[PDB]
Short mmCIF file of N, CA and C and ligand atoms in Angstrom, two decimals:
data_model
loop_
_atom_site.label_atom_id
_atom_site.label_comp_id
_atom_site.label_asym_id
_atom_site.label_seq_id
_atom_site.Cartn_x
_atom_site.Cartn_y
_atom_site.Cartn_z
N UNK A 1 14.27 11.82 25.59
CA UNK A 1 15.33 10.92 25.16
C UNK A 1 15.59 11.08 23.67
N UNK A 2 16.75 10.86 23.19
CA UNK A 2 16.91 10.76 21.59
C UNK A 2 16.09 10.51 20.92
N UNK A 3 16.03 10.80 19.60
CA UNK A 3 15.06 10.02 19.04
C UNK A 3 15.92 8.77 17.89
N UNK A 4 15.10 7.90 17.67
CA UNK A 4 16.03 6.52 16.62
C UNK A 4 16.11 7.38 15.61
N UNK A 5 16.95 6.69 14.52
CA UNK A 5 16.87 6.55 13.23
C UNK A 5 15.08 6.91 12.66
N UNK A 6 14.89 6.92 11.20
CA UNK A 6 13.82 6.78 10.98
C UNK A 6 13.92 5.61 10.31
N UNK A 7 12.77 5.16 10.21
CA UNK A 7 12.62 4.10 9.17
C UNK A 7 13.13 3.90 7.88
N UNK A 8 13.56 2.48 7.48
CA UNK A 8 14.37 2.72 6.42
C UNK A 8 13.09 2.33 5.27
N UNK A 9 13.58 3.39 4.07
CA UNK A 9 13.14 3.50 3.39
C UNK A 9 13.21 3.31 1.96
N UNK A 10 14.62 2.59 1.97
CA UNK A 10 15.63 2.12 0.61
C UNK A 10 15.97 1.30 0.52
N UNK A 11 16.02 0.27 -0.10
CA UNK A 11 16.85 -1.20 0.36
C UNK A 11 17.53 -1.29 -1.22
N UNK A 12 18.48 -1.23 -1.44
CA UNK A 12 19.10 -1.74 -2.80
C UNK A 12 19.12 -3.40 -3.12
N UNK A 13 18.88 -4.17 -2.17
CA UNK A 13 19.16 -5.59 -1.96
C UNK A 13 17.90 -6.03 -2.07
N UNK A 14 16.48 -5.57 -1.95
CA UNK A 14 15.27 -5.64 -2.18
C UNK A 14 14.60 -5.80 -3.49
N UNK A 15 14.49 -6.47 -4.14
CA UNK A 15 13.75 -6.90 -5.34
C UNK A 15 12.56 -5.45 -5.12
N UNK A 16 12.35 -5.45 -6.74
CA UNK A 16 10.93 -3.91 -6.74
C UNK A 16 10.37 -4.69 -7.79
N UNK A 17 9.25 -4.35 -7.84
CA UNK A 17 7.70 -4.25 -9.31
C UNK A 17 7.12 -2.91 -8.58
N UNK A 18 6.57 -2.59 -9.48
CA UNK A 18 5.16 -1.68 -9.63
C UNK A 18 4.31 -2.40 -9.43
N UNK A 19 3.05 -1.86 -9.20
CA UNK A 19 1.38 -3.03 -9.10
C UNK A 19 0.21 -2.08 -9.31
N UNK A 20 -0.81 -2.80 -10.16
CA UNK A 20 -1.85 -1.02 -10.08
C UNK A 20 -2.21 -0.88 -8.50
N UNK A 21 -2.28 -1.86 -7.47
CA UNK A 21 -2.54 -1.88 -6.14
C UNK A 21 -1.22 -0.64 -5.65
N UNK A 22 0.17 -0.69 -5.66
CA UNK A 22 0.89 -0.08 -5.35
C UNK A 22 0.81 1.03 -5.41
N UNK A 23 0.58 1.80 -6.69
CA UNK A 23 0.28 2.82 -7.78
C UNK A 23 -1.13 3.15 -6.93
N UNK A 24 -2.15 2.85 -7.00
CA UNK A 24 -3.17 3.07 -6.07
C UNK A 24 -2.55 3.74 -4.55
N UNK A 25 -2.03 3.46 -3.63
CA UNK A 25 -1.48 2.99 -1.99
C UNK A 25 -0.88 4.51 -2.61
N UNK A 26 -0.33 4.92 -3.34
CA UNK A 26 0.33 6.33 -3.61
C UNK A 26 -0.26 7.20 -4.37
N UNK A 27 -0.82 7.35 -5.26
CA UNK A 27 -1.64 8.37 -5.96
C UNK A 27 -3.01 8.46 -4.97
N UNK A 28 -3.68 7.35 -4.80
CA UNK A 28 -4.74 7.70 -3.98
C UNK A 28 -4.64 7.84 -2.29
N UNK A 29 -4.49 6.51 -1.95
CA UNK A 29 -4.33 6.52 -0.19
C UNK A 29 -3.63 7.69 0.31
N UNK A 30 -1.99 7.32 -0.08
CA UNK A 30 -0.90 8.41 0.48
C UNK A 30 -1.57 9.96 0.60
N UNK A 31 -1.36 10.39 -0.75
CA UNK A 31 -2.26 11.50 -1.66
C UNK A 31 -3.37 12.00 -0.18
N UNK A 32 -4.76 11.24 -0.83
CA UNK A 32 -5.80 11.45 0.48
C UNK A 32 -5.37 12.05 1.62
N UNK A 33 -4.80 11.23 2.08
CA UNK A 33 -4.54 10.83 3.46
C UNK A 33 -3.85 12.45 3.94
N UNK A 34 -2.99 12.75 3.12
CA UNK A 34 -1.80 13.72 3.70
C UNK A 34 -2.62 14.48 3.12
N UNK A 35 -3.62 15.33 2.82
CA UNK A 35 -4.25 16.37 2.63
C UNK A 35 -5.14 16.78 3.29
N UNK A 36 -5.85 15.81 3.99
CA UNK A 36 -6.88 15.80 5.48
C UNK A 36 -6.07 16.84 6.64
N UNK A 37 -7.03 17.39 6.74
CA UNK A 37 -7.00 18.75 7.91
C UNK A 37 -6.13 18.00 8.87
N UNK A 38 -5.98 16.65 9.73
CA UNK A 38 -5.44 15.80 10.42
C UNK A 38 -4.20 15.51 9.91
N UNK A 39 -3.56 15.43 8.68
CA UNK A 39 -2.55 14.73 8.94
C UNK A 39 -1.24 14.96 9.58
N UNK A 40 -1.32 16.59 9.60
CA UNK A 40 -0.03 17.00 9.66
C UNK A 40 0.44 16.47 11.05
N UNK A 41 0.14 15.61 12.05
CA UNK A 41 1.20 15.13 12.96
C UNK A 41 2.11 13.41 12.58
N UNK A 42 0.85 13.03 11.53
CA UNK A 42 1.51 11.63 10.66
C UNK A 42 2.41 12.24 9.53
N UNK A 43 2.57 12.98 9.09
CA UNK A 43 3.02 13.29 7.98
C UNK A 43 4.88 13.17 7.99
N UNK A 44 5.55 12.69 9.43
CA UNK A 44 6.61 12.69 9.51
C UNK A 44 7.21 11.61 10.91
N UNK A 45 8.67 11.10 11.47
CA UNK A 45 8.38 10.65 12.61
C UNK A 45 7.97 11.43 13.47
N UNK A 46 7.60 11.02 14.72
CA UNK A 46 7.26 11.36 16.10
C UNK A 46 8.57 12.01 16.45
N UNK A 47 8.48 13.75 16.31
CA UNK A 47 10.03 13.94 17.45
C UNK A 47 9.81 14.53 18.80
N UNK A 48 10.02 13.41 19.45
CA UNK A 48 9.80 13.33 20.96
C UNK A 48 10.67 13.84 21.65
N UNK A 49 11.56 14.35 20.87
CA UNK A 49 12.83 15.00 21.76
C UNK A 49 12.16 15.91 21.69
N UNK A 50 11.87 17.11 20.19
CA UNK A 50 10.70 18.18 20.31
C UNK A 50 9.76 18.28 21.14
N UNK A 51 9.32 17.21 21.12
CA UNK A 51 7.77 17.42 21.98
C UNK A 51 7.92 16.68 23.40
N UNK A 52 9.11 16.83 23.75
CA UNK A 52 9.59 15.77 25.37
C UNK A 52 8.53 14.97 25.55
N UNK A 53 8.92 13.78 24.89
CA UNK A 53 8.31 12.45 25.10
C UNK A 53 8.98 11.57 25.26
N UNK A 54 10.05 11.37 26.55
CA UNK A 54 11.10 11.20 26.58
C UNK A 54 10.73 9.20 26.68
N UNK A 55 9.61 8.95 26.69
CA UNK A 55 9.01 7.64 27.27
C UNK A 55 8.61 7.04 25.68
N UNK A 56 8.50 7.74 24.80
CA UNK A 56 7.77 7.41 23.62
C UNK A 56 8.46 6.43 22.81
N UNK A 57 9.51 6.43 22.36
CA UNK A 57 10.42 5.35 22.33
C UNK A 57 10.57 4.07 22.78
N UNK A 58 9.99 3.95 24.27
CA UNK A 58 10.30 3.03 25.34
C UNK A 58 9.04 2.23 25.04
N UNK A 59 7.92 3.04 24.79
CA UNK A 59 6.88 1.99 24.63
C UNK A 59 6.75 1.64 23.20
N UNK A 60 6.64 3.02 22.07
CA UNK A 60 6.79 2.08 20.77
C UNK A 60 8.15 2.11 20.23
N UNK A 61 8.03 0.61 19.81
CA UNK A 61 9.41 -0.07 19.40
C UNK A 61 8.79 -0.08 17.67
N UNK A 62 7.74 -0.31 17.04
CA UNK A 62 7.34 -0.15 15.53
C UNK A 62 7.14 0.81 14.84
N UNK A 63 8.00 2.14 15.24
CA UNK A 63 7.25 3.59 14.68
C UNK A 63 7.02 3.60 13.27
N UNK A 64 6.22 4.60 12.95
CA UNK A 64 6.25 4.68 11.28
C UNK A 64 5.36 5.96 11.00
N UNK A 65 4.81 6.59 9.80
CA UNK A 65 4.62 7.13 9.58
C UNK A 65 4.58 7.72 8.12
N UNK A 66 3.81 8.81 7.46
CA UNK A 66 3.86 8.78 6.51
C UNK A 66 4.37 9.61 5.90
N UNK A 67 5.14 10.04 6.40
CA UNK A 67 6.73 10.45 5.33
C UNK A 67 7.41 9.40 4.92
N UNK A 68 7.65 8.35 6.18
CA UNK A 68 8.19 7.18 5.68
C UNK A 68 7.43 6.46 5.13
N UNK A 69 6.16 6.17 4.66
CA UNK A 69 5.37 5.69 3.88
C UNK A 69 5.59 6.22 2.00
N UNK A 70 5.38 7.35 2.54
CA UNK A 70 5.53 7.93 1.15
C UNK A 70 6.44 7.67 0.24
N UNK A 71 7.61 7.67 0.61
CA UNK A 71 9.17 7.55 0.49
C UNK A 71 9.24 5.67 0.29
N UNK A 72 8.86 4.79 0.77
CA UNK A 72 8.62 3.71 0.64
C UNK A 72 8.32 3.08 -0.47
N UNK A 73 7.05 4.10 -1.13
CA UNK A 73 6.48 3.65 -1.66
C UNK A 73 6.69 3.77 -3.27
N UNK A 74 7.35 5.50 -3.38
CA UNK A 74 8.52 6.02 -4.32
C UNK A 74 9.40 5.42 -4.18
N UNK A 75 10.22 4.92 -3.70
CA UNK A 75 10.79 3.96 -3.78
C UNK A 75 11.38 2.40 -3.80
N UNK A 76 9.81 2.34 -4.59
CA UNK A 76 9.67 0.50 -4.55
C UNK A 76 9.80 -0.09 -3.87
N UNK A 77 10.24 0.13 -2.58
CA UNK A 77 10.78 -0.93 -1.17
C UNK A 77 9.40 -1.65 -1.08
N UNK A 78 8.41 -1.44 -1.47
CA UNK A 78 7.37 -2.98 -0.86
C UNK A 78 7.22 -3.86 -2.23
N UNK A 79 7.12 -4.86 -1.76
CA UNK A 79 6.86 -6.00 -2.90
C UNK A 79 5.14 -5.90 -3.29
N UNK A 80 4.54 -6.07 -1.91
CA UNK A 80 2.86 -6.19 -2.34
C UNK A 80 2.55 -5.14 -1.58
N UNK A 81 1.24 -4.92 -1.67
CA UNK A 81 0.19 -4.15 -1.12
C UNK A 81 0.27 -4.18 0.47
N UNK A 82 0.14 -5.81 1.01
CA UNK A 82 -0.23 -5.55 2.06
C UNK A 82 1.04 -5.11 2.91
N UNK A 83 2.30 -5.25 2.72
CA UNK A 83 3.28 -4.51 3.46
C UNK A 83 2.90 -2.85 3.65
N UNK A 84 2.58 -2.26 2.37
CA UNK A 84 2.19 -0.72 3.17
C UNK A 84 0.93 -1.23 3.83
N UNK A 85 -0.21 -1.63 3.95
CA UNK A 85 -1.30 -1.20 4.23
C UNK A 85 -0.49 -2.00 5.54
N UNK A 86 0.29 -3.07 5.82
CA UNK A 86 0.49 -2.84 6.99
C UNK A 86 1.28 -1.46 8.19
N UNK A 87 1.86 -1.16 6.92
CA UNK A 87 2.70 0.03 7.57
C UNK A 87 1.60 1.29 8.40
N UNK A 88 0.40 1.33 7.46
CA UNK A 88 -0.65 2.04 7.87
C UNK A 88 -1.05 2.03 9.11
N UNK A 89 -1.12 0.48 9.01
CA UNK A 89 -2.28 0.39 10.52
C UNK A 89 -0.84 0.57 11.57
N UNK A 90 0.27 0.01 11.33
CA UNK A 90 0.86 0.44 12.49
C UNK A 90 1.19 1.60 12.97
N UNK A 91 1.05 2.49 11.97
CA UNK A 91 0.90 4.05 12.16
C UNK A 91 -0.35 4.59 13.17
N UNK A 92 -1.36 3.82 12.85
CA UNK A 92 -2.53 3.92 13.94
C UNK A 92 -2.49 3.35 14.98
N UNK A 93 -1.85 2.20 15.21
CA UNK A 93 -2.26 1.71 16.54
C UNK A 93 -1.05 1.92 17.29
N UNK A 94 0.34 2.65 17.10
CA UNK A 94 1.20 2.67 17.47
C UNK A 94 0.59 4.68 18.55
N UNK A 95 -0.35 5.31 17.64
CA UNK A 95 -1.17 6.14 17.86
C UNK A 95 -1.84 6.06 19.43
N UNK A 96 -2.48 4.81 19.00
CA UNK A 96 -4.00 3.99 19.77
C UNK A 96 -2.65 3.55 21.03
N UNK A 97 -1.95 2.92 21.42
CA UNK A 97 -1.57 2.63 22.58
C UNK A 97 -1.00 3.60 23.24
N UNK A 98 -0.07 4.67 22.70
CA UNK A 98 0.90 5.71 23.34
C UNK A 98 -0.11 6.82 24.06
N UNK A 99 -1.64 6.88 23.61
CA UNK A 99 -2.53 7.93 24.19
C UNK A 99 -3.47 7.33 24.54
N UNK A 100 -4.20 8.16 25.53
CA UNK A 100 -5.76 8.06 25.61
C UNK A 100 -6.73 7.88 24.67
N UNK A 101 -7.79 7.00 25.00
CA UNK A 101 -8.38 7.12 24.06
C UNK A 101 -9.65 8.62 24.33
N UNK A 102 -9.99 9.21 23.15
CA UNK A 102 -10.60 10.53 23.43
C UNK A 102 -9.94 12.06 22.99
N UNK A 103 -8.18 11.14 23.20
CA UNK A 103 -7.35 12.35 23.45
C UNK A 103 -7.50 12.95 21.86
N UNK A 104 -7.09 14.56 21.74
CA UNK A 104 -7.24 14.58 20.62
C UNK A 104 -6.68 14.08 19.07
N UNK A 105 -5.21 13.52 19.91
CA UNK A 105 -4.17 13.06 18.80
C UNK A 105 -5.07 11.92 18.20
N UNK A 106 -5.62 11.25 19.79
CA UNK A 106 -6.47 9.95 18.70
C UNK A 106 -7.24 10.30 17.72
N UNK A 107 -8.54 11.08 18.30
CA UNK A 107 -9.53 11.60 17.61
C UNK A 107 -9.12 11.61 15.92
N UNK A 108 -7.85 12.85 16.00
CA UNK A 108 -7.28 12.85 14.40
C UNK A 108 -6.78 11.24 13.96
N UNK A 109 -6.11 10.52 14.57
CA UNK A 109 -6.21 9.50 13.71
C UNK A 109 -7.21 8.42 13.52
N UNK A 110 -8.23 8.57 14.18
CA UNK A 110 -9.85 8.00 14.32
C UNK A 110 -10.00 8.56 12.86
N UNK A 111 -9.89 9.51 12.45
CA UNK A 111 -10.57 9.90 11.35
C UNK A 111 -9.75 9.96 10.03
N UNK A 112 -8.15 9.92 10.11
CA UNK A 112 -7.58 9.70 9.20
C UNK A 112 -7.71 7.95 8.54
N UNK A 113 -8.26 7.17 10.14
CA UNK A 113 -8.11 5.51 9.76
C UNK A 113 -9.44 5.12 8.99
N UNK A 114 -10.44 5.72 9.55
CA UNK A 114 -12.03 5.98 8.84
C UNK A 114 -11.60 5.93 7.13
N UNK A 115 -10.64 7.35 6.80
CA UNK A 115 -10.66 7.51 5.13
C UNK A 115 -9.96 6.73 4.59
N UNK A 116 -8.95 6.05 5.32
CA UNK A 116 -8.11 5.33 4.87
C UNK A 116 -8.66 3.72 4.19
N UNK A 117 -9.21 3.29 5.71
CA UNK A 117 -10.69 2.01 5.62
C UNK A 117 -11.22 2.38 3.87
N UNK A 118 -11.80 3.14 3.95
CA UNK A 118 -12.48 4.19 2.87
C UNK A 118 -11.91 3.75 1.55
N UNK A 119 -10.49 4.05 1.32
CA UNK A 119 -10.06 4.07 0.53
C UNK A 119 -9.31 2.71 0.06
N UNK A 120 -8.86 1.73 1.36
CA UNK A 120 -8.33 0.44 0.62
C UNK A 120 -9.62 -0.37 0.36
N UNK A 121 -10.88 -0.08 0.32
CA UNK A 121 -11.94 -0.83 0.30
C UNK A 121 -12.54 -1.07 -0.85
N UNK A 122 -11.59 0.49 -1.57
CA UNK A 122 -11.50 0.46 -2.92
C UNK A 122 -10.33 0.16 -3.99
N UNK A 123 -9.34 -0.68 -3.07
CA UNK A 123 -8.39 -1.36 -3.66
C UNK A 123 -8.28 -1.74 -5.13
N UNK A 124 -7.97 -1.39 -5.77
CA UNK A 124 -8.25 -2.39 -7.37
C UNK A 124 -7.54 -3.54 -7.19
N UNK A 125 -8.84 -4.57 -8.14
CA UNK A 125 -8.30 -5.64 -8.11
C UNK A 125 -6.63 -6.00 -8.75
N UNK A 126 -5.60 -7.09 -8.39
CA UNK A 126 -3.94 -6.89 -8.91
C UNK A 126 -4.19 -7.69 -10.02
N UNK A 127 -4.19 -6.30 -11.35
CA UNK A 127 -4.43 -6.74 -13.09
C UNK A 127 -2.88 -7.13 -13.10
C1 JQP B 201 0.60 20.34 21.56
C2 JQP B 201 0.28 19.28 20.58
C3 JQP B 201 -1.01 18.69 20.60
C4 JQP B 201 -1.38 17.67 19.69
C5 JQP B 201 -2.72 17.03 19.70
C6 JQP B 201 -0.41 17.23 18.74
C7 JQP B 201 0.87 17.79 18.70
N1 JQP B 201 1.85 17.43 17.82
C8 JQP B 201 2.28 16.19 17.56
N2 JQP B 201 3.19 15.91 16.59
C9 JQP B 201 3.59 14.64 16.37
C10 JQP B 201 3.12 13.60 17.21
C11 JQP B 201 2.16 13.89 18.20
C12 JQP B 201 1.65 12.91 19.09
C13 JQP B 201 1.43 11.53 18.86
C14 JQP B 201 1.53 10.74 17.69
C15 JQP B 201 1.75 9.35 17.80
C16 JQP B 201 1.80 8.53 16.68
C17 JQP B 201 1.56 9.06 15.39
F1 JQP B 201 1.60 8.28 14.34
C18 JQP B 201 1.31 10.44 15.26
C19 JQP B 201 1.29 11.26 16.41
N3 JQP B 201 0.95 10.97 19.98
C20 JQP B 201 0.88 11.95 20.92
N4 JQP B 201 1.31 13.13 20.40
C21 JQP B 201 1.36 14.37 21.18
C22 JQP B 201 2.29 14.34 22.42
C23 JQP B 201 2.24 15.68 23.19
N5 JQP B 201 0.86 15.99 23.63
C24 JQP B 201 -0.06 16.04 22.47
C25 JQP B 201 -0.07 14.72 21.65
N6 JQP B 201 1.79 15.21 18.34
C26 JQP B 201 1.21 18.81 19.63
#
């Protein structure tokens, strides 16, 4: 089936700050994250038309990912922290329901969510 739009990633109507937490979520997390032997199937949306997943759509309705993370985040669209770190986990569990668990897609994001854990754990405190 088609695939949506991607996530929007710009809002002109959206109030922006910087935060060292923000600044962190992109120099470190993002950074990390997309350099792991694993990332390259997060690193963009799901194209299910590519990969005939013609059902993938139907079940997740929250896609995301971290191209659109990245881009988010360069572009000031979050106010605080926890909007990306939510964007994160829905990147994983949007993962965690569409497959098996075992399968290997999980496996890679089992271990991208591990460094990630990893890394907001080292959040700096918001100076
Ligand atoms: C042949 C082959 C094998 C593997 C292991 C991966 C890929 N490539 C690829 N690229 C983007 C996505 C997925 C994917 C996802 C998925 C879901 C959410 C998310 F955030 C990230 C990925 N969930 C499932 N998949 C595929 C669907 C077809 N069967 C393999 C898993 N796979 C291609």
């Amino acid at each position: 089936s088609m695939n949506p739009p991607p996530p929007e990633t710009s809002n002109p109507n959206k109030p922006k700050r910087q935060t060292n937490q923000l600044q962190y979520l992109l120099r470190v997390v993002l950074k990390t994250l997309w350099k792991h032997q694993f990332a390259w199937p997060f690193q963009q949306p799901v194209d299910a038309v590519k990969l005939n997943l013609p059902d993938y759509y139907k079940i997740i309705k929250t896609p995301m990912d971290m191209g659109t993370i990245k881009k988010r985040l360069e572009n000031n669209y979050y106010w605080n922290a926890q909007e990306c770190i939510q964007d994160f986990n829905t990147m994983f569990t949007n993962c965690y329901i569409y497959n098996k668990p075992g399968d290997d897609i999980v496996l890679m994001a089992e271990a991208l969510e591990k460094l990630f854990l990893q890394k907001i754990n080292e959040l700096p405190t918001e100076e």
